[PDB]
């Protein structure tokens, strides 16, 4: 009967999928996740959703390694973000299995975004209320950072920010982001943006770095590493 | 805010499944009360038997049901839902005996009914089956009388004594106030029928109540014939 159906995959008078717009709002009310693309790699830095003196910072709530060459930061619902992270990991491994090559970052982004968009356009199910900052490396586009939203729309960003106070982080990145940054410089910029738009415990970091011989490596900074990075700032 | 919470099994702003509680109300619409007492030596379930016409065959107006030869089920609630849960419990027991090779325990049958009520209270397209099920019987592996009560919510719990129906609250109060580790199956049956008679407020005759007294001598489920029920009722009237 669809009496209580919300018509999730239905346009609104303005031509917007209301469920996708509300998912975007949910993201904008979530912890800030900033991505900064430096010379060889990308620094992702997210605000943990679940913090407090009684919370145990054992795992990255928002940072999720997708593959040896791709890491992600989450803004919004960490649950459906985890679902899409599982799908992204499976897609990267399927690409590796098919081609014996690490999935190009844009293809993994396209896959997760096609999942999101399939939820926005078919099935009458709510969209994934998560925005991903997918940092990655591939031989084609070098090191990349992609911002993906619940609509399934993604774009490459040298630097960007999502979540709470994402506009302030974006403005700070515009003011201070420079090309050809070093890993240290980009980490400092991300820490500065996070602090200016918001504590090491609450914050989590992940540096993708491409070395010529070692390849692309994802390193999600632990509590102690993030504490050291914050104290450096 | 849409009104799905009050018509479907989705949570309301208070986090309540309104349809589950309304299925509790539908269970109480059965207009009958069942009192089950499980002693060390026996489990007696007595459910007052109401026939609305003299033209209805009384043998068909039942709330006691054979699920397996061992497991009985006193089902209180909407007669259609009671029939559905009788056949569902029997199918659960049959599937369990086929997969596992032995008769379903009352506990596992109660858990399977709880899972059905959980899928009713979680799947919005499935109604909560308005049946309070008192599953009972002698579990051979433990050689002890299992007595589980599964609510329309699916809230399944083993009970030393339980009640269902309209006077479930009063019957439960009487059970938890006067319960004992009765020494004989006759004592268990007397207590069950006395509790049911007291909470219902009407002196019962064998026709007016179905009694299943599963003992170790007779562990197979069976409604007590009206002569044994009459003897139990006389014993109740004896004191």
């Amino acid at each position: 009967t669809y009496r209580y159906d919300a018509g999730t995959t239905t346009f609104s008078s303005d031509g917007r999928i209301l469920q996708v717009e509300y998912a975007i709002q949910s993201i904008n009310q979530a912890g800030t996740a900033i991505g900064v693309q430096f010379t060889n790699g990308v620094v992702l830095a997210a605000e943990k959703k679940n913090t407090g003196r009684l919370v145990d910072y054992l795992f990255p709530e928002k940072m999720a390694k997708i593959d040896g060459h791709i890491v992600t930061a989450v803004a919004g619902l960490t649950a459906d973000a985890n679902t899409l992270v599982d799908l992204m990991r499976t897609s990267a491994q399927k690409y590796l299995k098919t081609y014996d090559e690490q999935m190009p970052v844009e293809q993994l982004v396209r896959m997760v975004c096609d999942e999101k968009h399939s939820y926005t356009q078919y099935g009458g199910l709510r969209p994934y209320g998560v925005s991903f900052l997918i940092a990655g490396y591939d031989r084609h586009k070098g090191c990349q950072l992609y911002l993906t939203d619940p609509s399934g729309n993604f774009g490459g960003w040298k630097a960007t920010a999502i979540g709470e106070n994402n506009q302030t982080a974006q403005s700070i990145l515009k003011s201070q982001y420079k090309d050809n940054m070093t890993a240290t410089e980009a980490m400092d910029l991300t820490v500065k943006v996070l602090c200016k738009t918001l504590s090491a415990d609450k914050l989590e970091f992940a540096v993708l770095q491409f070395r010529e011989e070692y390849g692309p490596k994802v390193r999600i900074l632990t509590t102690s590493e993030v504490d050291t990075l914050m104290k450096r700032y | 805010s849409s009104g799905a919470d009050r018509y479907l099994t989705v949570f309301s702003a208070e986090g309540r499944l309104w349809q589950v509680e309304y299925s509790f109300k539908a269970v109480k619409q059965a207009e009958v009360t069942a009192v089950a007492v499980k002693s060390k030596n026996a489990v007696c379930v007595a459910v007052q038997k109401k026939v609305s016409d003299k033209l209805i065959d009384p043998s068909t107006v039942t709330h006691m049901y054979r699920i397996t030869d061992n497991v009985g089920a006193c089902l209180v609630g909407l007669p259609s839902d009671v029939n559905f849960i009788v056949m569902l419990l029997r199918s659960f027991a049959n599937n369990f005996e086929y997969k596992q090779g032995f008769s379903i325990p009352v506990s596992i049958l109660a858990q399977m009914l709880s899972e059905r009520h959980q899928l009713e209270s979680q799947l919005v397209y499935v109604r909560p089956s308005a049946v309070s099920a008192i599953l009972f019987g002698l579990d051979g592996p433990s050689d002890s009388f299992a007595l589980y009560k599964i609510e329309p919510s699916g809230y399944s719990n083993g009970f030393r004594a339980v009640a269902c129906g309209v006077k479930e609250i009063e019957a439960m109060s009487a059970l938890e106030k006067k319960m004992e580790d009765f020494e004989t199956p006759e004592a268990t049956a007397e207590f069950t029928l006395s509790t049911l008679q007291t909470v219902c407020g009407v002196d019962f005759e064998a026709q007016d109540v179905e009694v299943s007294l599963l003992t170790r001598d007779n562990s197979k489920f069976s409604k007590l014939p009206n002569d044994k029920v009459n003897e139990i009722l006389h014993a109740v009237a004896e004191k």
């Binding site: 009967t1 | 009050r6 018509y7 309104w18 309304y22 509790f24 033209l55 007669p79 259609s80 308005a130």
Partner: protein, 230 residues
């Protein structure tokens, strides 16, 4: 029902299934059909208030064959009535396929109440606006399934318009102490007494499953009882 009467799987705050009892009202609107378990058999009478005089007198059955030994009187939404009749025939056929024997009216009643219950238990279905009285003399069974799926065996079942007065009249007669042949005049008396004068031409479709029919569902011969009335 303040919104609790549109979805069949929706309980009223009081636990009522409003769609189910609306189907029951559909049953109540229909002309009365009553089965009586007699000593020689079971007699299913069904009042047929011919809305149009052009209706074929020997047609528009309210009572249907389910088996060589099971008849099904129907009350209420005629589409649902025949849907349940065909589903009961299918249930009996599937029962024979699974078990090789003929289903019994109690067991057929349980299996068909399964479908009745599915109507208001799973979404996307409509409760069956019909009551079905399955009579079998082989089984000595007269089981009526109500739209809810509540099925009960009866000594004398009756559903439809004036079904309460019909039940009261059926109480006055010990059907199991009389044969179907001598129960036919009594059942016809009851139906005629409770018949509404709004219809001048009407019939009493009377089937019986008796020793005379060897338990077979047989429409009562017109010689035994003239169903036509004007």
């Amino acid at each position: 029902g303040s919104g609790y009467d549109f979805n069949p799987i929706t309980f009223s705050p009081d636990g009522r299934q409003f769609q189910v009892e609306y189907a029951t009202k559909a049953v109540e609107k229909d002309s009365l059909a009553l089965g009586v378990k007699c000593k020689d058999g079971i007699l299913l009478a069904a009042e047929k208030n011919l809305t149009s005089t052009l209706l074929t007198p020997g047609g528009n059955p309210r009572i249907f064959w389910i088996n060589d030994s099971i008849a099904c009187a129907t009350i209420g939404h005629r589409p649902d009535c025949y849907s349940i009749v065909e589903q009961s025939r299918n249930r009996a056929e599937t029962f024979t396929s699974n078990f090789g024997i003929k289903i019994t009216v109690p067991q057929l009643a349980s299996e068909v109440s399964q479908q009745f219950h599915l109507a208001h238990y799973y979404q996307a279905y409509r409760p069956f606006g019909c009551t079905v009285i399955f009579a079998s003399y082989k089984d000595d069974a007269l089981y009526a399934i109500e739209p809810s799926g509540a099925f009960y065996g009866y000594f004398a079942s009756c559903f439809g318009k004036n079904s309460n007065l019909a039940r009261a009249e059926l109480q006055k007669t010990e059907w199991k102490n009389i044969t179907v042949r001598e129960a036919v005049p009594e059942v016809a008396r009851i139906i005629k007494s409770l018949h509404e004068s709004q219809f001048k031409k009407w019939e009493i479709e009377m089937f019986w499953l008796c020793e005379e029919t060897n338990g077979r569902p047989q429409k009562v011969p017109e010689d035994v009882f003239q169903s036509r009335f004007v």
